[PDB]
């Protein structure tokens, strides 16, 4: 499951819905095996839409769990059109593409910070229901 998905997965126990600790889940980085899918094509327009949607604090938390400590504490901001993007903006976009879309968890384990429920990812598939669309 793509790194991006960790930004939209909360504990499936209904009693946890009211907790501030139901999301994000706590990924066990000692157990999560990561794989790169480089066949996913870079699309800046699509990526800009994605970056706008993510909860940045949860990106930072999960990334650190999975061994990435090179992200800025504030979500990168970008101009309103592709034409206005700098080379530096594009380099950031490329890095975000690699992180959010090309990086997948093939196998792993993650838990609810509120209730301690342990979930699993097997052959890239979590045993918690995936949402049909990604929104906060």
Q: Please report the DSSP string for 47-93 in residue order.
A: HHHHHHHS-HHHHHHHHHHTT---S-SS-----SSGGG--HHHHHHH
Tell whether residue 9 is a contact of Zn ion (CB under 5 A): no
Which one of 5, 6, 7, 114 is in contact with Zn ion (CB under 5 A)?
Answer: 114
Tell whether residue 118 is a contact of Zn ion (CB under 5 A): no
Stretch that binds Zn ion, among 51-59, 81-89, 98-106, 116-124 (CB under 5 A): 116-124
User: Measured from the CB of residue 117, what is the shortest distance to Zn ion in angstroms?
Assistant: 5
User: Measured from the CB of residue 19, what is the shortest distance to Zn ion in angstroms?
Assistant: 7
For residue 104, the SS3 value is: strand
Cis peptide, bond prior to residue 4, ω within 30 of zero: no
């Amino acid at each position: 499951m793509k790194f991006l998905t960790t930004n939209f997965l909360k504990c499936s126990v209904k009693a946890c819905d009211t907790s501030n600790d139901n999301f994000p889940l706590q990924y066990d980085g000692s157990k999560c095996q990561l794989v790169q899918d480089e066949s996913i094509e870079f699309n800046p327009e699509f990526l800009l839409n994605i970056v706008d949607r993510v909860d940045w604090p949860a990106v930072l938390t999960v990334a650190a769990e999975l061994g990435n400590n090179a992200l800025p504490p504030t979500k990168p901001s970008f101009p309103s059109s592709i034409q206005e993007l700098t080379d530096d903006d594009m380099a950031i976009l490329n890095d975000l593409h690699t992180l959010l879309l090309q990086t997948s968890i093939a196998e792993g384990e993650m838990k609810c910070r509120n209730c301690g429920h342990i979930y699993y990812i097997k052959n890239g598939i979590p045993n918690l229901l995936l949402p049909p669309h990604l929104v906060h």
